Design a protein around this ligand. Structure first.
Ligand SMILES: CCCCCCCCCCCCCCCCCC(=O)OC[C@H](COP(=O)([O-])OCC(O)COP(=O)([O-])OC[C@@H](COC(=O)CCCCCCCCCCCCCCCCC)OC(=O)CCCCCCCCCCCCCCCCC)OC(=O)CCCCCCCCCCCCCCCCC
Ligand SMILES: CCCCCCCCCCCCCCCCCC(=O)OC[C@H](COP(=O)([O-])OCC(O)COP(=O)([O-])OC[C@@H](COC(=O)CCCCCCCCCCCCCCCCC)OC(=O)CCCCCCCCCCCCCCCCC)OC(=O)CCCCCCCCCCCCCCCCC
Ligand SMILES: CCCCCCCCCCCCCCCCCC(=O)OC[C@H](COP(=O)([O-])OCC[N+](C)(C)C)OC(=O)CCCCCCCCCCCCCCCCC
Ligand SMILES: CCCCCCCCCCCCCCCCCC(=O)OC[C@H](COP(=O)([O-])OCC[N+](C)(C)C)OC(=O)CCCCCCCCCCCCCCCCC
Ligand SMILES: CCCCCCCCCCCCCCCCCC(=O)OC[C@H](COP(=O)(O)OCCN)OC(=O)CCCCCCCCCCCCCCCCC
Ligand SMILES: CCCCCCCCCCCCCCCCCC(=O)OC[C@H](COP(=O)(O)OCCN)OC(=O)CCCCCCCCCCCCCCCCC
Ligand SMILES: CCCCCCCCCCCCCCCCCC(=O)OC[C@H](COP(=O)(O)OCCN)OC(=O)CCCCCCCCCCCCCCCCC
Ligand SMILES: CCCCCCCCCCCCO[C@@H]1O[C@H](CO)[C@@H](O[C@H]2O[C@H](CO)[C@@H](O)[C@H](O)[C@H]2O)[C@H](O)[C@H]1O
Ligand SMILES: CCCCCCCCCCCCO[C@@H]1O[C@H](CO)[C@@H](O[C@H]2O[C@H](CO)[C@@H](O)[C@H](O)[C@H]2O)[C@H](O)[C@H]1O
Ligand code: SF4
Ligand code: SF4
Ligand code: SF4
Lengths: 52, 115, 94, 49, 186, 154, 45, 176, 318, 52
């Protein structure tokens, strides 16, 4: 959850109350290199579900 | 003596710690601080009201089972008897009757808690 | 990442997985914290001609509700019945 | 053996901090004894690693 | 204070009772020693205790009242009691067993001197003994609470507010009416 | 005299700030960032900060979220039921001063109308790190207490 | 200059696991029970 | 499509039955669970060493507010009041008048930081980049009154943090 | 020289208990991917001292509705009886050498239950009462099974003397001939010490704090100290009962070293189990003992009565 | 764009706490499955409606 808060904070500047999704689209574009980091997180997450 | 000395020291130390705990700290006592706790809202009724026991039948059976141990605890000494033929029969007899009593209560739903 | 081979072996055996391939601590596989500047694209309405706003005004094409009945032949349902879902071929039974 | 090589990094930490006295200072001030590259120092004396 | 600040309002309260007072709480705490020692069995002292909120309202009204300057006020309660009646009433409202017994003046300074040895807040002192047994003065020439718009509160309305915490569980829920008022000095 | 009580303050202060047990008490959003301070990245437990559910076994109340009028009597109750010394940390805009519900008919405009507050942590919510900064600021407040020094000079 | 924004790599990303993987481990019930009774008999002896 | 999470009938062959009897009696699946927490015991913990180590943030982070200047030292704020109008929390209070040189400038600029929701709308609305949310998140105070910022406080914040504020704006303004 | 011996027993116990709390917080920390105390003293070594000082300068509370005498009596029994459980332990020499040390510990452990009942009752609050009656339920669950489990083991030792268990296990640990009993004994000690997954009388997530929810400061500390002293004592007893350490009369310290390591590891396993499992429902604890352990314990009791006779392996009375 | 991703809906059979627990865990796995598609099929273009 802490690493996913970093995705919230990187697109919006806030960990929780992003205010990012708005009527008409989103507030800002994804910063360069974010989708790589989201892929890195997602590559390993299923293993965490397995430990759970 | 040694045992009495040991017991007195144990409960003397415990009492000294309680005494220190009560007279060392600075106290500020008022009604709200000492009111009964119940998650922030006042208790609804007395905590001395009856509290139903759902395992009451198991609790009585414990009294009868809890006396089987007194009858069985002498077994290590009984194993030193010359008359081992009689021993083993009577030791096995008691445990089986205890097992049968347990089976009876089990099959008759005596171990199920009342709703 | 600094754990010794014996400890790597031990926590692999205890967990029953290869924990090293998918570490939960991030090292240098993450993006650099200084990135080059972007150059973001513009939208469809960034034209110098054939772009009158009155041809692309969604708010002005909204209309009041259609009065079907006002108190001032076959039976129908609100929509066709929903189709029955099919079982997954990816993994039908978890 | 690995266990010996692990125990040699514990002693490099002691010297890497300038002796036992320097090792204890960071241990009690920061609760950490890792030795890192000095990246810079600011005008107030903070050191960055 | 009178010469230094001639236009100062001076307020002279009787003993004040309230949740955090050293008056009703004081008597209620004597239970920890068994009986309640009193000089001359509390039959020689008269008290006119005044409620804390009465004093506070009187102070606040003096600030705003232009005629309170250079005056001296006596803030006293509405009823005068014999000490013995007061302390007996304190134990009735707290529902604690009351075992009064006389203690001469000299011997009960000895106890006061023994409590003064605490480096902390003394439980009682010789001076505390003197004050508790001092008869409250009657000063008709000074204006009172009534002259500052305050209507004095009887000890009976607010005693339970202070003394309920001193009861055991068995008596925590007794209402205000369960204890008859102390006898007053008319 | 002065030297002994000076050291004794240092000792009781050190023990109290090194063993801070917050009440298990959260109200709304900000309680989520309070969880993240207990989570591995920040690990409040490593500072000696341990949640305990009972008010009797708690030293700090962290007001983490909006305080409504309906909740206000309950919050005051569990605060009063903490033994002393006790501290209150006001976390987030709602607790600090009503925040984004400041003008609501059902919200208390700041928890300091109900309890005394030692530390105010700003944010909506404050990051987990910002709350940790507030807890460590509360520790340094406790490090400066002069209970025995003042007692000695009474 | 050409448009630059966060995009996937040209080939796409590598496969991402998601299905449950709880591997099988241990010995048969017979083997486990046999080891236990073997332990008991040596203990009694 | 859909899948079943719990709809499997266990096999009833004496080997499978004996396997489950061993599981019931030898606690094998509870032992297996002990293996997992044992493995974690020998993993490096994720804890950082705050305040000597900090958590990672981005140039978009929404922290403490500050009023900015132009390179000359003139204030950017021109008392347009767009930030005050958009503020969802009504946390901004502004008064303005002509300055002694005729400039359009504020005489009051308050942010009630206990009303603010740190949403960043004010810095979106500002047409001159006057009001921003800087990177500072470590400004907890001991009193409520210390969190009611006036113009002098916010201008000092701008001068205090301008070196970092400018670098963050430089890294993200092309996404705006 | 006996008073000195008593202090050499109970003062170290209180120190071991203090640092067990630190070790628990660290071990659970690392199993939870964090660190646990490492600021207050190096590696958190001063944390137990800070917690101890803080509690004993915290204000104690007497709840308004509480029964005063039983409220104060209950924590004194808890710590007093917890320390009494150590006087017969052969380490390798007991402080008090009892003929019936095994039965003495059974009696004291039964008496220590009342420190829960009376603290919960005297508190006169509902959460305290609910916790107290869970203690009644928990004792009913394990007491009958616990005694008969011990009896089966003592049929191979031939005595109720704790020191005779050392002699019985001179050639081999009793866990070999009795691992089914060691399994049920180990579970019974978790239930007996109110330890997770059987931490029901306190049960944080259900009862706030259960039987001692109204206790603060020093009186609370006594309950906490008693719990952790009982954790260590019951694992020492488990080590003596099933993992007998050879005793050399001329080098008794070597016994104490090996014996201590086994007890530490068994205590560590209590922390390990706490980090791994959810909590039982307290009627499911009763059924576990009565419907599973009890039928098997009764059968193994008959087996261990017969086995010495049929193998001609009856031990001596001495 | 939920009509353009593939995922399965977990379904319980006993309507109890355990089945809802298993449904939620399997929903996390399907979320990762969707996230993998969003990462690969992210299109270029503007982020808010081109209507000022
Ligand atoms: C009573 C018991 C306590 C007293 C016994 C003391 C025994 C000696 C302890 C020595 C530990 C020193 C650790 C060290 O070298 O730090 C280097 C470290 C530098 O290494 P690094 O760069 O961080 O890299 C570390 C590895 O990469 C990453 O670390 P790692 O995970 O790879 O571990 C490295 C090493 C560390 O281990 C040791 O060196 C000690 C092994 C003793 C095992 C005792 C059990 O372990 C091994 O090499 C494998 C063998 C270890 C035995 C494992 C057995 C597991 C139990 C079996 C499973 C079942 C459990 C149920 O420097 C420090 O941080 C110094 C810190 C000082 C801490 C205190 C050390 C003293 C410990 C307490 C002594 C008593 C007071
Ligand atoms: C080790 C010592 C542990 C006990 C420590 C007791 C003193 C603790 C201080 C204390 O009681 O709080 C202040 C408390 C006064 O505060 P309070 O709230 O105003 O008292 C409320 C009522 O007095 C009502 O207060 P209560 O709820 O405590 O009830 C009074 C008492 C009942 O007291 C009586 O009615 C007569 C005395 C009974 C005790 C005599 C033994 C009972 C029969 C067993 C025979 C054993 C013989 C040896 O309750 C008992 O049943 C005492 C049981 C203690 C037995 C200890 C085992 C022997 O006690 C006094 O100092 C007086
Ligand atoms: C029985 C007596 C037990 C004595 C415990 C000694 C307390 C040790 C201690 O104070 O910690 C060192 C601490 C260490 O400093 P610190 O507690 O301020 O450290 C702050 C946290 N770091 C370092 C990570 C930023 O020293 C003190 O704080 C001074 C307190 C002196 C206590 C007086 C003892 C008499
Ligand atoms: C495992 C066992 C662990 C036991 C650990 C025990 C603690 C060890 C560390 C002791 C250090 C000293 C602690 C002092 C804390 C006092 C509480 C406090 O802070 O109050 C502030 C008070 C100051 O209060 P004050 O006078 O400034 O004002 C109080 C009034 N109000 C609230 C309005 C402000 O300190 C004192 O009153 C005196 C300080 C005494 C310090 C020396 C201790 C002597 C106490 C003896 C009491 C007499 C009864 C005997 C009790 C038995 C004693 C062994
Ligand atoms: C030559 C002739 C020989 C004659 C003798 C032969 C005897 C050999 C065969 C005897 C049987 C061996 C097993 C004996 C142990 C007791 C087994 C047992 O009771 O398990 C069942 C019990 C309940 O499980 P459950 O499935 O929920 O209930 C049945 C469903 N109706 O399961 C449980 O107890 C659940 C326990 C939950 C709590 C576990 C927490 C701790 C787990 C880790 C501990 C690991 C073991 C540590 C042992 C320490 C020893 C020092
Ligand atoms: C409601 C509040 C309750 C609070 C609880 C307070 C704590 C209670 C503590 C339990 C009290 C009962 C103590 C029973 C001791 C039994 C121990 C024992 O049996 O051994 C001690 C010894 C006999 O030992 P043994 O080996 O069997 O025979 C001698 C062979 N050389 O025999 C001796 O050493 C002589 C001792 C005789 C005097 C014992 C006095 C006990 C009376 C109660 C106090
Ligand atoms: C699968 C996980 C289950 C978790 C459940 C908890 C299990 C934890 C078990 C902890 C106890 C492990 C035993 C500790 C071994 C220490 C042994 C030692 O240091 O001494 C050597 C000893 C043999 O010597 P000794 O025991 O004296 O001889 C027996 C004859 N009486 O020993 C020789 O090896
Ligand atoms: C519902 C009621 C249930 C009642 C169940 C009672 C079960 C009792 C089963 C019999 C138990 C004893 O069984 C009996 O034990 C003794 C040993 O002590 C054996 O006796 C054998 O050993 C003894 C001494 O050990 C020798 O003196 C003897 O020469 C030899 O025969 C018997 O050969 C055996 O038959
Ligand atoms: C000599 C010592 C060793 C011998 C064993 C002695 C104890 C024997 C215990 C009784 C065994 C038979 O009696 C018992 O009766 C109940 C009827 O409610 C049966 O059936 C019941 O048991 C289980 C668990 O409670 C339930 O899941 C089931 O729904 C219910 O039908 C049990 O399957 C059976 O085990
Ligand atoms: S301060 Fe913000 S995050 Fe905290 S409860 Fe209020 S709105 Fe939610
Ligand atoms: S961040 Fe949002 S709530 Fe705070 S001042 Fe700016 S617009 Fe108002
Ligand atoms: S800060 Fe910006 S938006 Fe607000 S009044 Fe000044 S110029 Fe306008």
């Amino acid at each position: 959850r802490e690493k996913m808060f970093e995705f919230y904070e990187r697109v919006s500047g806030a960990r929780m109350h992003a205010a990012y999704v708005r009527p008409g689209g989103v507030h800002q574009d994804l910063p360069l290199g974010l989708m790589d980091d989201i892929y890195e997180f997602s590559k390993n997450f299923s293993l965490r579900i397995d430990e759970l | 003596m040694n045992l009495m000395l040991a017991l007195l020291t144990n409960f003397t130390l415990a009492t000294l710690l309680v005494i220190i705990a009560f007279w060392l700290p600075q106290l500020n006592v008022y009604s709200e601080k000492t009111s009964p706790y119940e998650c922030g809202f006042d208790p609804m009724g007395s905590a001395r009201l009856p509290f139903s026991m759902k395992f009451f039948l198991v609790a009585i059976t414990f009294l009868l089972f809890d006396l089987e141990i007194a009858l069985l605890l002498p077994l290590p000494w009984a194993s030193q008897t010359a008359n081992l033929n009689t021993m083993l029969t009577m030791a096995l007899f008691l445990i089986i009757l205890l097992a049968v009593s347990l089976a009876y209560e089990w099959t008759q739903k005596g171990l199920e808690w009342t709703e | 990442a600094s754990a010794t081979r014996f400890i790597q072996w031990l926590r692999n055996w205890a967990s029953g997985r290869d924990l090293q391939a998918k570490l939960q601590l991030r090292y240098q596989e993450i993006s650099k914290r200084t990135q080059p500047p972007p150059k973001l694209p513009v939208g469809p309405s960034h034209k110098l001609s054939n772009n009158y706003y009155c041809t692309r005004d969604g708010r002005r094409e909204a209309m009041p509700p259609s009065i079907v009945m006002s108190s001032q032949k076959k039976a129908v349902s609100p929509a066709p019945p929903i189709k029955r879902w099919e079982l997954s071929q990816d993994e039908p039974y978890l | 053996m690995e266990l010996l090589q692990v125990l040699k990094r514990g002693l490099q930490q002691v010297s890497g901090h300038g002796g036992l006295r320097g090792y204890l200072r960071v241990l009690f001030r920061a609760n950490d004894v890792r030795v890192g590259t000095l990246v810079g120092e600011d005008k107030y004396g903070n050191k960055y690693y | 204070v009178r010469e230094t600040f001639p236009e100062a309002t001076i307020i002279k309260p009787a003993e004040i009772f309230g949740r955090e007072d050293r008056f009703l709480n004081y008597f209620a705490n004597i239970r920890w020693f068994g009986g309640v020692p009193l000089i001359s069995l509390g039959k020689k002292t008269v008290k006119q205790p005044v409620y804390i909120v009465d004093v506070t309202k009187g102070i606040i009204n003096a600030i705003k009242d232009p005629d309170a300057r250079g005056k001296t006020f006596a803030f006293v309660g509405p009823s005068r009691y014999l000490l013995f009646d007061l302390v007996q009433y304190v134990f009735a409202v707290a529902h604690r067993p009351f075992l009064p017994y006389p203690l001469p003046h000299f011997a009960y300074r000895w106890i006061g001197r023994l409590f003064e040895i605490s480096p902390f807040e003394p439980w009682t002192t010789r001076d505390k003994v003197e004050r508790i047994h001092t008869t409250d003065k009657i000063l008709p020439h000074l204006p009172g609470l009534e002259d500052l718009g305050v209507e004095a509160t009887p000890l009976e309305l607010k005693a339970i507010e202070v003394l309920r915490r001193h009861r055991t569980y068995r008596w925590l829920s007794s209402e205000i009416e369960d204890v008859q008022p102390a006898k007053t000095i008319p | 005299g002065e030297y002994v009580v000076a050291k004794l303050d240092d000792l009781i202060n050190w023990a109290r700030r090194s063993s801070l047990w917050p009440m298990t008490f959260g109200l709304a959003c900000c309680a989520v960032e309070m969880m993240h301070m207990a989570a591995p990245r920040y690990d409040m437990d490593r500072f000696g900060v341990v949640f305990r559910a009972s008010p009797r076994q708690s030293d700090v109340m962290i007001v983490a979220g909006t305080l409504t009028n309906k909740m206000a009597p309950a919050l005051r109750k569990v605060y009063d039921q903490m033994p002393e010394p006790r501290y209150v940390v006001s976390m987030g805009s709602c607790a600090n001063g009503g925040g984004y519900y400041h003008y609501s008919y059902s919200v208390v405009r700041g928890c300091d109308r109900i309890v005394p507050v030692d530390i105010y942590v700003p944010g909506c919510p404050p990051t987990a790190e910002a709350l940790l900064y507030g807890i460590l600021q509360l520790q340094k407040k406790i490090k400066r207490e002069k209970r025995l020094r003042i007692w000695y000079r009474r | 200059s050409k448009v630059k924004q966060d995009m996937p790599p040209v080939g796409g990303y590598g496969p991402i696991d998601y299905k449950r993987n709880l591997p099988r481990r241990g010995l048969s019930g017979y083997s486990m029970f046999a080891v236990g009774i073997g332990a008991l008999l040596f203990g009694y002896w | 499509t859909y899948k079943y999470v719990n709809l499997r009938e266990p096999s009833m062959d004496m080997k499978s039955v004996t396997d489950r009897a061993a599981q019931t009696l030898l606690w094998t699946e509870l032992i297996r669970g002990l293996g997992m927490t044992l493995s974690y015991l020998f993993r490096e913990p994720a804890t950082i060493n705050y305040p000597f180590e900090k958590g990672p943030l981005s140039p978009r982070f929404r922290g403490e507010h500050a009023l900015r200047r132009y390179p000359s030292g003139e204030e950017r704020c021109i008392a347009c009041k767009l930030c005050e109008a958009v503020c969802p929390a009504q946390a901004i209070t502004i008064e303005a008048e002509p300055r002694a040189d005729g400039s359009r400038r504020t005489t009051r600029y308050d942010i009630d930081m206990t009303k603010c929701i740190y949403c960043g709308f004010c810095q979106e609305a500002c047409p001159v980049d006057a009001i921003v949310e800087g990177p500072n998140f470590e400004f907890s105070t001991e009193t409520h009154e210390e969190l009611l910022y006036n113009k002098e406080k916010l201008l000092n914040n701008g001068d205090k943090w301008e070196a970092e504020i400018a670098a963050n704006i430089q890294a993200d303004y092309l996404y705006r | 020289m006996f008073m000195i011996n008593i202090l050499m027993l109970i003062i170290p116990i209180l120190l071991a208990v203090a640092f067990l709390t630190l070790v628990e917080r660290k071990v659970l920390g690392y199993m939870q991917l964090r660190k646990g105390p490492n600021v207050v003293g190096p590696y958190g070594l001063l944390q137990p001292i800070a917690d101890a000082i803080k509690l004993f300068i915290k204000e104690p509370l007497r709840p308004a509705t509480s029964s005063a005498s039983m409220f104060i009596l209950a924590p004194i029994m808890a710590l007093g009886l917890a320390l009494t459980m150590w006087i017969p332990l052969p380490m390798p020499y007991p402080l008090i050498n009892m003929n019936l040390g095994v039965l003495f510990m059974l009696a004291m452990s039964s008496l220590a239950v009342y420190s829960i009942l009376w603290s919960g009752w005297a508190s006169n609050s509902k959460y305290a009462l609910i916790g107290a009656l869970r203690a009644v339920a928990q004792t009913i669950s394990y007491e009958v099974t616990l005694a008969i489990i011990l009896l089966s083991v003592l049929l191979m030792s031939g005595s109720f003397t704790l020191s005779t268990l050392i002699t019985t296990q001179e050639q081999m640990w009793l866990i070999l001939p009795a691992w089914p009993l060691a399994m049920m004994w180990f579970i019974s000690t978790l239930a007996e010490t109110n330890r997770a997954p059987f931490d029901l009388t306190e049960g944080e997530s259900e009862l706030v704090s259960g039987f001692n929810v109204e206790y603060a400061a020093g009186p609370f500390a006594l309950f906490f100290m008693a719990e952790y002293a009982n954790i260590i004592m019951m694992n020492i007893f488990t080590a003596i009962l099933f993992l007998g350490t050879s005793h050399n009369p001329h080098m008794p310290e070597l016994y104490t070293i090996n014996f201590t390591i086994k007890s530490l590891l068994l205590t560590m396993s209590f922390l390990w189990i706490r980090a791994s499992y959810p909590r039982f429902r307290y009627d499911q604890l009763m059924h576990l003992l009565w419907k599973n352990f009890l039928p098997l314990t009764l059968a193994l009791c008959m087996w261990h009565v017969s086995l010495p006779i049929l193998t001609s392996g009856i031990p001596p009375q001495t | 764009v939920y009509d353009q991703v593939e995922f399965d809906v977990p379904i319980g059979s006993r309507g109890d706490c355990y089945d809802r627990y298993l449904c939620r865990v399997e929903e996390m796995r399907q979320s990762i499955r969707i996230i993998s598609q969003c990462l690969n099929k992210m299109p270029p273009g503007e982020i808010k409606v081109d209507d000022a």
